[PDB]
Design a protein around this ligand. Sequence first.
Ligand SMILES: Clc1nc(SCc2ccccc2)c2[nH]cnc2n1
Ligand SMILES: Clc1nc(SCc2ccccc2)c2[nH]cnc2n1
Ligand SMILES: Clc1nc(SCc2ccccc2)c2[nH]cnc2n1
Lengths: 233, 233, 233, 233, 233, 233
Amino acid sequence: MTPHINAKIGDFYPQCLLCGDPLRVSYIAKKFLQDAKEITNVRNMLGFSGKYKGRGISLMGHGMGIASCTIYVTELIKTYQVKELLRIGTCGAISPKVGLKDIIMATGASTDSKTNRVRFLNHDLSATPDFELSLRAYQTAKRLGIDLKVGNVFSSDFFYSFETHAFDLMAKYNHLAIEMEAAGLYATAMELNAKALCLCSVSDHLITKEALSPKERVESFDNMIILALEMMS
Amino acid sequence: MTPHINAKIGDFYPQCLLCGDPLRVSYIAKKFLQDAKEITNVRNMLGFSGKYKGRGISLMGHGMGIASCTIYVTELIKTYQVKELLRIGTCGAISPKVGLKDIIMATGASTDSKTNRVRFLNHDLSATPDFELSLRAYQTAKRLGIDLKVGNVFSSDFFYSFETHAFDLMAKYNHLAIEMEAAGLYATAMELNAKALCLCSVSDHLITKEALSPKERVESFDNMIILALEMMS
Amino acid sequence: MTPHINAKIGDFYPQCLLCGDPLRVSYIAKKFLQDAKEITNVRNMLGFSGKYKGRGISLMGHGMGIASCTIYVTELIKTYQVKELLRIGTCGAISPKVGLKDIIMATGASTDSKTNRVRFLNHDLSATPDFELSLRAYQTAKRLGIDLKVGNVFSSDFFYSFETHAFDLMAKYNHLAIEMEAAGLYATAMELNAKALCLCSVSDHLITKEALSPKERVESFDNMIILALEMMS
Amino acid sequence: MTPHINAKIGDFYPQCLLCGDPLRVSYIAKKFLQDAKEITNVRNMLGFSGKYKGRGISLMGHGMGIASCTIYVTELIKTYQVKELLRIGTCGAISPKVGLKDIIMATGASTDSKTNRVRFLNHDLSATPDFELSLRAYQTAKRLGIDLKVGNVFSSDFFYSFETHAFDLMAKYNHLAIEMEAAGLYATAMELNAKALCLCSVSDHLITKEALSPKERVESFDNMIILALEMMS
Amino acid sequence: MTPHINAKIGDFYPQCLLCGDPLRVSYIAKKFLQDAKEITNVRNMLGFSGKYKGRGISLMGHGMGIASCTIYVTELIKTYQVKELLRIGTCGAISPKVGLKDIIMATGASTDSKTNRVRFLNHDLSATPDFELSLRAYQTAKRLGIDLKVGNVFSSDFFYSFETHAFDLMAKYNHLAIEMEAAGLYATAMELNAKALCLCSVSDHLITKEALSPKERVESFDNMIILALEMMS
Amino acid sequence: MTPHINAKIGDFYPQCLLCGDPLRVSYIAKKFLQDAKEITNVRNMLGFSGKYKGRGISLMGHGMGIASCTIYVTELIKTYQVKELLRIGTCGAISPKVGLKDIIMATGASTDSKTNRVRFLNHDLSATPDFELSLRAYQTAKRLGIDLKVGNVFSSDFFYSFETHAFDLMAKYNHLAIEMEAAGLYATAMELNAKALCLCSVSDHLITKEALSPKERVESFDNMIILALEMMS
Ligand SMILES: Clc1nc(SCc2ccccc2)c2[nH]cnc2n1
Ligand SMILES: Clc1nc(SCc2ccccc2)c2[nH]cnc2n1
Ligand SMILES: Clc1nc(SCc2ccccc2)c2[nH]cnc2n1
């Protein structure tokens, strides 16, 4: 066991879906998995293992922000032997190319965090997902007829940004939305030689000023959840 | 009313005790408060309002990491009108000046985060608590017979550090322990003109490798809890 | 029409293949294109327009280094209306996952340059290629029987590195090879909403010290050239 | 002896008051100490030892700026065995919370200097005073009926700032005034395990545009001087 | 031989003139040198050796940007034994002190590159030329009656700057013009204990909006070329 | 008229000689000037005006450190209309190219300070002297039979360095000696369009550990003083 996960070694399948919200994770387990079992619950951060269309898959909450996400992903890889990590989170749209509830695949995660400079020689680590997972997401979305939006996200240490004046510049450089964990997921999976990808659905729109309720952030994104389950089967 | 808290405006008392672990918040509510009511539970991050010696006291979990802590503290101040925020938690000791079950009061929080540079003109923000609250902590601790250890902590973006070789230098510069949120708590409270303080309990020494027993950990944390509840009376 | 290119507006096809060495551009024009016409030669940096399997294709040299590459790519997009830019070249391998005559597709370009910090709010820009172009490269490579190696490259301001001790850490974080322009190609193309990609051929392994023979180098580079010309068809 | 102090070892008492201006130091010796002796004068930087209410106390000039202050404080601690260092300087008010000639106690010293990044792993050192000295200053001011203003100061390498547009932001983050040495005093005393505190009286007001003459900067601050002498007795 | 120069050891004279444009180098060889021989041509980057007034002198192209220039200068010094390197390039005027086609001697080369921080402890390397070469240029210009403008240049990684709003500030700090290689020439020659100087003629004026054609950038600067040849004889 | 200088406007001649030590300024006034009058003494930082060979010459102390030097130099230029500023002092040699009683002329001043980044867009300012003044120094030194050693110095915020292991790298890059103000003198004078230069005398070699005798130190410094006074004639 680890300080933040109280499952047994082997309780996790090698493929794991992730959300920051452990209640979205619980929602997915109850609605979409067969024979789902809760396998961890330290700090109320739930994780589960179950089956989708006969294939074992795990689910795990990763909390909010790069530091939190790095903790759980690090332990999932090094202790629990997880090989493929698919984040399915929420994000704030800053580009006019996307609308509320669109699903974005993050081809790269820019950041205002210092974590990657600390990791990577004080240089610019371009944090990126595994290409095969990215390809699988693209192909599965096409097979399902889901309009997958593809581009960079900006992973911030701030939900309440001090730099909103810079969002248009971010969008000009192909950042479709802002969230807070992808760059940490990506850099941890690069560190540890694991396969990771980040999808996020648009829960807030900074141009149109739209925002979903907390309940809607759990329940409104079945399309992104089903996309994730299909690509992992 | 916010994406991360679903309490009604007015549910929070203006004095709030915070922990990273929402189950520790739950423990405090059930064991130490009278008439405790759960008031928020988005993302399983529990908060409560109750009374201690007739005085209204709120409790809120804030998760792991500066970014997570900054979300909750910002919303508590700006939406729920919280005025005093007392963070309690455990911390890994790195200084020979502290030992097991010591309680540290952080009069400064250094960091490897980029957040305060983003907040503060790319310069060095000295992240400090409210002085009156620190004085209140010192006077209450003396009246309870607690020998408070006072110094800096180091707030890291990394639980699994890449710089363990630097702990000794940290200790030389009067950093007694490492944790992961104090600098964000303090910078947010300075931004927003609120009173904040961080106390942390030594259950593990990262240098000597000494660790408390599980019943000593419960006992040590209860002493902290009482110190915190007494200074909010 | 620009200080560095003396072609007439309209001389460039909207799809352009790029190399750092203008003599390699010349080699490609004479060996692989039909009706090739030299269209620019300022500073001896040659560019050409010709046809491959009836399709119009342009070629342009860009010199060595992010700053040099950014000049040419900017002018090609903004003045000559180039829309797709495929960079091919050699790169020094640093990862045990690649070997001699492997072809790498860079889905991210890290850097020791300050350019992307200057472009991007002093934060970390994740410099990434156009996803559709990368997918086109992967599908074309499979149809030609090429096993494309996909990962990051590190774009350095230094040919003669002062940080050779850091190559292993670079490789750990999924940097397969080092070159000197991809991060600038990618950042310029994101700035200007153009589609860009970088492929590089392994003729030298900087770790194992293995090197191709001069006829193997020609042979390896021709395979790249054909892959590039086929994806622009 | 040291390059910058020509006193004998043992000439300094373990408690020392500091000013940047050696003529304020001389003023204090003549007006407030019994049997004051000049004990050092290299570079015209005067230092003294004498008695206040029967208790031995020393005085020393530290010149202007972090670099200058670091030199004298370093030598006072390592060669002359000084244990408690109380800076009593001047500062420029940037916050509407304070007026001309108010006395500020610096709970922390933010800075635009690079010295603490050079000292502290290129991270953010939150430079802070010794808590017991801070407490003593608070209690002595109360006993004397002095209205001690308490908060952060910003220690700058610039008296003539290039960033006056940022002063309101500084004040929002609880920086009451700007001066040029506290962060260096604090970081040197943290380095060397000594007790330090910075008090400063407001000699310039950046909101009301007030400014004292050079003579007034020596002679107008008896209240802060007497506060210092009382807390050290 | 080196990867970027295919001359024999000894083909270069110890004194070498440099331009970024290998066609300006070729122009000088044909128009001004006796018995000029082309001695290198990798990547179309021409170099020559010939005689001026009986004295052997070499010429070499260095391409565009600090990274490119660093490659050729490094190899010229370490392999080809070049002792004195005189850059005679072009630049964009940002100061009202100079006009189109003025000749500037760069007493120092500021930069937005990270290369010197990577070279020099992450501190500020003030990149400067050899004083004796500077003196020789001053004296030769006086003997020839050429009005040599003297001050700093700013060496940028950007020809198309994202910071034009800062050019007036640059000019205030005695930066007469902007170019892209001097800081790299200067830092490489400091690294390797060689003598270097940068002269540049104004080919673009950012205040008056003037700009020369590509042909004029080769042919309009005989005065700077003859100055260079005279100081090296 | 300023917080740090109490001379009357007009008391300063437009040519000023500067030293960090005000007692050295005093020494020069009494030994080398005619009709010397003390004109300022705030903080014991003495300044004088007198004549040398009938020419009016001012002297001013500037203290230790870039921040201290910048205060005095700014006030001298902006309030007292000083136009030429010649700094003389001692410096610790770090290069094998210089030895005891050599005099160095600093044609560049590197630094570990953040001041020039704050002044100059967060980029690298190459801090350089006025060229005409440097030429005047070189011509006067030759006429007096002095073999001036010309190169960079390193201006540090630290007298007691934390980076002594880096002195050799400093020396490699043509830093002949270390001192603590030249970069600030030079940056202030470039900001304000004044002519400045720094000469420093080698009385200590920080590598070889050789040191002058106290009478050799007086003798060496007098030779400097005469060189300075002669170039201001
Ligand atoms: Cl950093 C980030 N920002 C947002 S919207 C920020 C936002 C804040 C205030 C007002 C409007 C919008 C997110 N929505 C889901 N994940 C997210 N991550
Ligand atoms: Cl950095 C600093 N600034 C000031 S007022 C700066 C100031 C400069 C120009 C005009 C008005 C005010 C101080 N007064 C006493 N100590 C101090 N330290
Ligand atoms: Cl960085 C640099 N910039 C310029 S003018 C830039 C410029 C760009 C766009 C429009 C007007 C001017 C140069 N001219 C010769 N060398 C040079 N180096």
